[PDB]
Amino acid sequence: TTRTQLPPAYTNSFTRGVYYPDKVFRSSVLHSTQDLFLPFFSNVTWFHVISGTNGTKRFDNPVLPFNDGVYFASIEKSNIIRGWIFGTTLDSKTQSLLIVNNATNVVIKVCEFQFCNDPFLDHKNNKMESEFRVYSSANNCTFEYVSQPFLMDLEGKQGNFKNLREFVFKNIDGYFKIYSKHTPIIVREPEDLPQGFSALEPLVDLPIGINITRFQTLLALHRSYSGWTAGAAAYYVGYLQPRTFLLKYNENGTITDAVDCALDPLSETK
Amino acid sequence: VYAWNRKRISNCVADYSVLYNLAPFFTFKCYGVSPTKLNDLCFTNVYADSFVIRGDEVRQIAPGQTGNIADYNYKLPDDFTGCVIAWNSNKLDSKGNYNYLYRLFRKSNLKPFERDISTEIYQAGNKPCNGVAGFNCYFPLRSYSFRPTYGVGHQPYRVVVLSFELLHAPATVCGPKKSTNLVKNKCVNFNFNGLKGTGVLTESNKKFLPFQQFGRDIADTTDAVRDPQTLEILDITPCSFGGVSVITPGTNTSNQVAVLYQGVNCTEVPVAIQLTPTWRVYSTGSNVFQTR
Amino acid sequence: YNYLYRLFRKSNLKPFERDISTEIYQAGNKPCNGVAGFNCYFPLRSYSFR
Amino acid sequence: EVQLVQSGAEVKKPGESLKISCKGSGFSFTSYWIGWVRQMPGKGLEWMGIIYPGDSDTRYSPSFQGQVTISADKSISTAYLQWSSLKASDTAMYYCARGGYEDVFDIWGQGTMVTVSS
Amino acid sequence: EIVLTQSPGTLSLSPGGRATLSCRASQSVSSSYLAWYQQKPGQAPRLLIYGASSRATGIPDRFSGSGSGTDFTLTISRLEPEDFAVYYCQQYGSSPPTFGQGTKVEIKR
Ligand SMILES: *[C@@H]1O[C@H](CO)[C@@H](O[C@@H]2O[C@H](CO)[C@@H](O)[C@H](O)[C@H]2NC(C)=O)[C@H](O)[C@H]1NC(C)=O
Ligand SMILES: *[C@@H]1O[C@H](CO)[C@@H](O[C@@H]2O[C@H](CO)[C@@H](O)[C@H](O)[C@H]2NC(C)=O)[C@H](O)[C@H]1NC(C)=O
Ligand SMILES: *[C@@H]1O[C@H](CO)[C@@H](O[C@@H]2O[C@H](CO)[C@@H](O)[C@H](O)[C@H]2NC(C)=O)[C@H](O)[C@H]1NC(C)=O
Ligand SMILES: *[C@@H]1O[C@H](CO)[C@@H](O)[C@H](O)[C@H]1NC(C)=O
Ligand SMILES: *[C@@H]1O[C@H](CO)[C@@H](O)[C@H](O)[C@H]1NC(C)=O
Ligand SMILES: *[C@@H]1O[C@H](CO)[C@@H](O)[C@H](O)[C@H]1NC(C)=O
Ligand SMILES: *[C@@H]1O[C@H](CO)[C@@H](O)[C@H](O)[C@H]1NC(C)=O
Numbered sequence: 028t029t030r031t032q033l034p035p036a037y038t039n040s041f042t043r044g045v046y047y048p049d050k051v052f053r054s055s056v057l058h059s060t061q062d063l064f065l066p067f068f069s070n071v072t073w074f075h076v077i078s079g080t081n082g083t084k085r086f087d088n089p090v091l092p093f094n095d096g097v098y099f100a101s102i103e104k105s106n107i108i109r110g111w112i113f114g115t116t117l118d119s120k121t122q123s124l125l126i127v128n129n130a131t132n133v134v135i136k137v138c139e140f141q142f143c144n145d146p147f148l149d150h151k152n153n154k155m156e157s158e159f160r161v162y163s164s165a166n167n168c169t170f171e172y173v174s175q176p177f178l179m180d181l182e183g184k185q186g187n188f189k190n191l192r193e194f195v196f197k198n199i200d201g202y203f204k205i206y207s208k209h210t211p212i213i214v215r216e217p218e219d220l221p222q223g224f225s226a227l228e229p230l231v232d233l234p235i236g237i238n239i240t241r242f243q244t245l246l247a248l249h250r251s252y253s254g255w256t257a258g259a260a261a262y263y264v265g266y267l268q269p270r271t272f273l274l275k276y277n278e279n280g281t282i283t284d285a286v287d288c289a290l291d292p293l294s295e296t297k
Numbered sequence: 298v299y300a301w302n303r304k305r306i307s308n309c310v311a312d313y314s315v316l317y318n319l320a321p322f323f324t325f326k327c328y329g330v331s332p333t334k335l336n337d338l339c340f341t342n343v344y345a346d347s348f349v350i351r352g353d354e355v356r357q358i359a360p361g362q363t364g365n366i367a368d369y370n371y372k373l374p375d376d377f378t379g380c381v382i383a384w385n386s387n388k389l390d391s392k393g394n395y396n397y398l399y400r401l402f403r404k405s406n407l408k409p410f411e412r413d414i415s416t417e418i419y420q421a422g423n424k425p426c427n428g429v430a431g432f433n434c435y436f437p438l439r440s441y442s443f444r445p446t447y448g449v450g451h452q453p454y455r456v457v458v459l460s461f462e463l464l465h466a467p468a469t470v471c472g473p474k475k476s477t478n479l480v481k482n483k484c485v486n487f488n489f490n491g492l493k494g495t496g497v498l499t500e501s502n503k504k505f506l507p508f509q510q511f512g513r514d515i516a517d518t519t520d521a522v523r524d525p526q527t528l529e530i531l532d533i534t535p536c537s538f539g540g541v542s543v544i545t546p547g548t549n550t551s552n553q554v555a556v557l558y559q560g561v562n563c564t565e566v567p568v569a570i571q572l573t574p575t576w577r578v579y580s581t582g583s584n585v586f587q588t589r
Numbered sequence: 590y591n592y593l594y595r596l597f598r599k600s601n602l603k604p605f606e607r608d609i610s611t612e613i614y615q616a617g618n619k620p621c622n623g624v625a626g627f628n629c630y631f632p633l634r635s636y637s638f639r
Numbered sequence: 640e641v642q643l644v645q646s647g648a649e650v651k652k653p654g655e656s657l658k659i660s661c662k663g664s665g666f667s668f669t670s671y672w673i674g675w676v677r678q679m680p681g682k683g684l685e686w687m688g689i690i691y692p693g694d695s696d697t698r699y700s701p702s703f704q705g706q707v708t709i710s711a712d713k714s715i716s717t718a719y720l721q722w723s724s725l726k727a728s729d730t731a732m733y734y735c736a737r738g739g740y741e742d743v744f745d746i747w748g749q750g751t752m753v754t755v756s757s
Numbered sequence: 758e759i760v761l762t763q764s765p766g767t768l769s770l771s772p773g774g775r776a777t778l779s780c781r782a783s784q785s786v787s788s789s790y791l792a793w794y795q796q797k798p799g800q801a802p803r804l805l806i807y808g809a810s811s812r813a814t815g816i817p818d819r820f821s822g823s824g825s826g827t828d829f830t831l832t833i834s835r836l837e838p839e840d841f842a843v844y845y846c847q848q849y850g851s852s853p854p855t856f857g858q859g860t861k862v863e864i865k866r
Contacts (some may be wrong), residue, residue, distance in 0.1 A: 052521065054504050114550065140404030201467055229508050234308075236466045280506055317617065317627050325627050331596055333616055387670070388691060396604075397807075445670055477640055676856075683845060684794075684802065684856040700853050734801055742847065742854040744794060744804035 028079065028254040029145065030086035032215075035072035035264075039217045040065055044267060045274070045285050046195050046206040046227035053276040059288075060274070063096050063197055065267045067287035073100070073219075073263040076107045078147070078246050084259045088145055090117060090243045091264055094292045096197040097242055100220055100263035102212070104182055104189040108255045109148045109247035110134070112161075113196070117142050119166050124203070124238050126245070128176045129156060135172035137235045138165055142243075150249035150257040156188045161245060170235050177230060180209040187215050189260060195227050195267070201236020204229060220263065226282040273297060298348040298370035299400040299438060300414055306343035309470040312336060316382060324383035328360050329461065332380065336472035342462035343379075343470050349390065349397040349441065352454030355383050369437070370399045374409035380458030390453030393444035400437040410460075413437075479524065484536040490525045494533060501532035537565050541573070563587050590635045597632030641665035643673075645735050648752035653727045658710075659751055660667075661718035661735030668716035669693035672739030675709060675720055678732040678750075689738055690718065695741050698740075724755075730755045759783045761791075761846050761857035769863040772838055778831035780846035780857055785826030789850035793822060793831050796859075797842040806831060807849065836862065 029130035044065030065071075077084040091097075093113060101108055106128055114123030119141030129148070146161035180190050188211065196208040206227040244262070248255040270289035286297050313336050316322060325332060348371060350358060359366030360377040367373070373381075390397070402419035420426040422433020430436055443453050475488065486495040492511060503512060503521050512521035512530075521532050546557035556578060558566060563585050568578040596612035610632075614623060617628025625631065646660040663673060674689035688699040692713045699709060708721035718735050734754055737745035770776060778793065790809040796802035807813050809823035809829070819835035827841040833840055841864075846857040 047508070050508050050510040052503070052509040054503070054512070056515060228506070234467055234469060279504060280509060280512075322627055325630075333597060333614075386695070388672075388693065389740060391670075392739060392743055392745075394741065448670070683858045684847075686854045686856075702853075736801070742792065742849050743807065744792070744802070747801035747803070750801060 028086050030080050032087060032089055033074075033085070033247065035074050037070050037072055038263075040067065040069040040071050041220075041222035041267065042067055042224045042285070043100075043220060043222075044195060044227070045224070045266065045272070045282065046208075046283065047229055050083075050229070051166075052280045054278050054280055056276050058274050058276065059271060061269055062172075063097055063267045063269050064272050064287070065265060066270060067290050069265070071263060071265040073261055076101075076103055076244070076246055076257070076262045077109045077259045078107075078248055078257060079259065083253060086145075088147075088244060088246065090241050093198075093239045093242045094266045094296065096195065096267050098263070098265035098267055099194040099196065099244075100261075100265075101178075101192045101194070102189050102220070103258070103260040103262065105150070105258060106178060106247050107150065107260055108244060108262065109150075109178070110176075110245040111196075112140075112146065112243040112244075112245050113143070113241075114140070115238050115240045117241060117243065119164060120273070122167075122169060122285070124161070124233075124237070124239065126176075127158070128178045128247070129158070131175055133172055133174045133176045135174070135231075135233065136168060137170050137237055140165060142162045146243065146245055146263055147248035147255060148245060150247040150255070153250055157248070157279075169237075170233075172233070174231075177207055178209075185211075185213075188212050189215070191220075193225075193227055196242075197267075198239050201234070202237070203233035203235065205231045205233070219261075224282075224284055243256035269277060298350060298366055299348050299416075301348040301371065304345045304347075306345060307341065307469050309343070310473055311343075311470055312473060319384065321384040321386070321388070322382065323385060324355070324381060324456070326359070327380035327381055327459075328377035335380070337462075337474075338461070339468035339471040340461045341464060341466050341469045344460045344462060345379075345457065346460070347455075347457040349386075349399070350383065350454055351441070351451040352383065352385070352456075353450045355454060355456060358383075358456060358458075365401050366399065368406050369401060369403040369413065372407045372409055372411055378461035378463065381456065381458045383456035384415040385453070386455035387445075387448075387453040390455070391443050391445045393442050395440035395442055397441045397443075398438035399441055399474060401439050402435050402437040427518055459514065475525075479526070481531070489522045492519065492522060494519060496533045496535045499532050499534065501530045503530055503532065505530050517540065537561060539566075590637055592636035592638060593633045594636060595632045596634040597630065641737075643735055643737060643746050643748035645733075645748040645751045648754070650754040650756070652757060653725050653729075653755050655725050656721055656723060657725055657753065658719050658721045659733060659735075659753065661720070661748055661751075663716050663718065663735075663737070663746075666737070668711070668713050670735050671745070672690070673711060673718055674736060674738040676734045676736055676738075677703075677720070680730075680732070684734075686742075687720075687733075689740070692716070706719060725753075725755050727755050729753060758852060759786060759848050759855060761848065761855060763844065763846055763857040763860040765860065765863045766858070767863060768769060769865070770836065771864065772836050772841075774836050775832050776835050776836060776862070778829075778833075778844055778860060780824075780831075782827040782828040782829065784849075786848060786851050787825040789848050791829050792813070792847055792849040793829075794845045794856070795842060796845060800842075801843060802843075805844065809849075 048060055048062050064115045064211055074087045080086055081216040109128035110126040112125055117123060119139050122137050124137045127218050140162045141164040142159055143163050147157055148161055150159040178192055182190055184189055191212045192209045197204045207230045208225055210225060248257045272285050274282050274285040277283045286294050288294055329568045354364045354366055356362055357367050360373045361375045403413060407413055416437045418426045418434050419437050420429050420434055424433055426434040481498050484497050501521050505523055510523045511519055514520040521530055523530050539561045542557040568580050591597040602608050614630055621629030642660045642664055669692050672689050672691055675687040676684050677687050678684045686700050686704050688709050690709055690711050692711050696712040697709055705738040707723045711718040730753060732750050734750040760783045763789040764779045764781055768776050792807045793805040794802040795805040804813050805820055806822035819833055823831045841862040844860040848854045
């Protein structure tokens with residue numbers, strides 16, 4: 028199921044994509060730092076996960092340049108997306124990182140991956156999985172990680188819940204830092220991400236030091252029971268440049284609020 | 298030795314004492330580095346190899362030594378990392394026993410860390426080898442023929458070589474470190490998972506998020522640390538310090554002096570307390586007055 | 590082979606210190622009295638100049 | 640030469656220990672893996688286990704593991720199969736033969752008849 | 758584990774002939790180098806042929822091991838009077854070894 032790509036919808040970030048820079052615990056202080064950050068009220072791109080055809084969604088799976096860092100917002104109800112692919116070349120010649128949301132296993136592996144033209148995982152485990160289809164072949168390996176995947180935030184707890192997971196991927200000093208935060212969506216709001224301040228706790232650091240320059244959204248797409256069906260839901264991609272942020276810590280140490288230094292004149296005063 | 302098996306070592310908290318434990322282990326030689334530092338060394342992509350050796354030519358197996366097995370069967374680069382570990386495998390390998398064939402026939406010496414996996418009848422002589430084995434044409438492999446009677450020579454000795462790869466990526470193979478006990482409520486110096494500091498350690502009422510590991514004060518000095526072994530949050534306070542000031546009526550009007558310990562309880566730092574150690578601060582019998 | 594260098598030592602000596610100790614270095618808990626075995630090895634190693 | 644002289648046959652009631660003694664001669668007891676084999680009257684042989692005198696490394700047969708006790712002494716170079724106590728079903732022809740993980744016959748002992756009856 | 762059926766149970770044939778010692782195995786183990794042991798009546802068994810088909814030292818050439826995997830056979834080309842005895846097959850290189858049930862030789866009844 029291949030369909031011609033369309034330009035992403037562009038929306039303001041508002042106050043989004045802010046994460047704890049370090050495991051330093053600070054209470055009731057205002058700390059300022061310069062680091063890769065999503066600019067506030069920055070205008071960012073998004074497609075739906077969509078990945079369909081014939082009215083049942085449309086196909087979208089671009090290998091976007093990884094660049095400095097990737098901000099990935101996911102508002103999917105089910106596990107429409109499962110895992111990601113991060114590669115400099117995305118071929119069997121050069122190693123690449125594969126992340127999977129299947130089962131209870133991150134399957135975070137840096138190995139040579141001859142990749143299919145369209146890597147689609149099984150949305151539901153076929154009554155088995157399309158892992159052998161997302162990559163044409165697996166050749167050699169460097170490191171493999173097994174853990175609880177990031178998206179165990181379940182959907183069956185309550186209605187109007189379309190799992191909202193925000194992720195920040197940054198590769199510094201041969202270390203791949205994955206920050207993330209999942210929030211109770213509660214409401215549908217079929218327009219964009221909420222303009223609510225929230226921080227992304229640092230989930231995982233990966234010691235593997237291979238360069239990453241491109242990134243493919245690894246989606247889950249099981250079967251038609253019309254090819255395969257997964258559904259449609261908005262997913263956002265953004266690149267965060269270094270900038271100065273003044274962050275507010277509460278007595279719990281949580282980042283309740285922060286202000287970008289540069290966006291508006293009133294900020295530099297603050 | 299003809300076809301050895303390779304291994305990759307990574308994400309390893311490796312202890313080398315376990316190898317020291319086994320008694321048949323009699324070869325701890327390391328051409329590269331001293332075994333004393335071996336456990337403390339941090340490496341990555343460590344590669345090991347194992348094989349079957351008669352043990353009479355184990356000296357030839359050492360890097361820089363030449364032998365027919367070193368010529369064909371096995372190769373060790375003269376520059377070496379790791380250790381060559383050999384233990385007497387006469388218990389198992391003996392019975393004779395002819396499975397583990399070793400190749401004594403090949404066209405040329407093998408390059409460092411090269412595998413000669415395919416056996417082709419060796420054309421040592423001028424006549425072509427076409428027509429299987431013949432005169433001046435022999436099968437490369439030879440039976441190792443481990444008869445239990447042959448004790449002095451060609452007895453079953455198991456040799457395994459450790460090779461260390463030198464920090465191409467961040468090191469992932471290291472030894473266990475930072476292992477001592479925990480104390481509290483005393484002026485001590487600590488290294489909390491690399492956080493080196495000195496001060497009195499006590500339990501804290503502060504609340505850390507799970508990813509939070511240390512906490513700093515307003516002045517950005519470490520004021521709380523989460524223990525690595527136990528998830529308890531421990532508060533750090535600096536060891537008691539302050540200025541000392543001396544009251545004197547004047548040398549010529551007597552020589553008695555009064556010492557003021559600025560900004561500290563008399564209780565925390567009494568005459569018991571070193572800095573100015575010859576000063577006994579007289580004694581508690583001498584009047585001790587607490588002022589703001 | 591006359592020239593020799595010390596492969597093993599308890600620790601580093603002091604600035605301008607001379608060490609001539611010749612006894613089997615003990616890297617193991619078990620005391621290896623005059624025994625050259627695992628974790629029991631005399632520190633000196635011949636230069637073996639070639 | 641290398642011969643494994645076994646103890647003589649014995650007759651005894653059930654419930655008592657029997658350290659059947661297989662003596663090995665003509666070979667280094669340490670250098671060779673010894674072992675035991677049992678035969679029911681009219682049945683094929685079976686493996687009971689192999690003992691290494693050098694380290695006393697005794698690998699028992701899993702089916703007979705813990706059922707009986709196999710041992711040996713290097714100083715005299717004699718196998719000492721305590722057999723634990725004796726069961727009425729244990730009446731059998733027991734050969735003590737040199738064998739290892741490769742399970743070679745090497746030298747087979749003359750065997751000892753153990754009868755367990757009232 | 759591997760169960761060795763020494764088919765046929767008994768062989769009745771004239772002296773000097775050839776025979777088949779079909780040691781059928783539950784699983785195919787040729788690397789185990791299954792060993793045939795010749796046991797004379799009232800005698801300690803003697804390993805007839807080791808190394809799957811390797812000739813045991815001091816054994817007449819009329820014996821010959823053969824076969825592989827799950828099916829191993831021993832052919833005694835010249836059945837001599839002394840060859841009339843019991844024959845067993847036992848897994849050699851495998852996990853705890855198991856002997857076969859046996860096989861006997863006969864002429865007439
Ligand atoms: C974190 O902020 C919350 C603000 O909701 C406060 O937590 C409350 O602390 C009081 C006093 O111990 C408790 O009685 C409440 O049950 C706490 N509520 C919650 C939701 O935890 C407090 O200011 C900070 N500390 C903690 C531990 O919550
Ligand atoms: C191989 O496995 C054995 C299994 O027991 C290890 O033996 C241990 O260490 C010493 C040396 O053999 C024994 O005396 C101990 O009884 C065993 N247990 C413990 C807890 O030490 C042996 O160390 C292993 N060898 C290697 C090289 O790993
Ligand atoms: C690693 O940490 C665990 C706990 O995080 C230690 O477990 C302690 O001892 C028992 C057995 O696990 C537990 O019931 C206790 O609650 C733990 N004590 C504490 C203070 O957490 C475990 O001992 C640690 N590892 C080692 C080798 O000591
Ligand atoms: C975001 O940028 C796009 C161009 O990439 C532009 O067309 C759009 O108007 C911008 N949106 C806002 C809200 O500024
Ligand atoms: C995780 O690993 C693989 C890859 O997903 C999968 O086949 C396996 O069943 C999983 N194991 C567990 C314990 O979830
Ligand atoms: C990352 O890979 C190599 C290995 O370090 C590096 O030299 C190269 O510049 C990077 N690849 C790119 C930028 O495509
Ligand atoms: C202080 O002492 C000096 C020396 O002992 C003496 O000369 C002087 O008179 C003294 N001063 C007073 C005020 O007594």
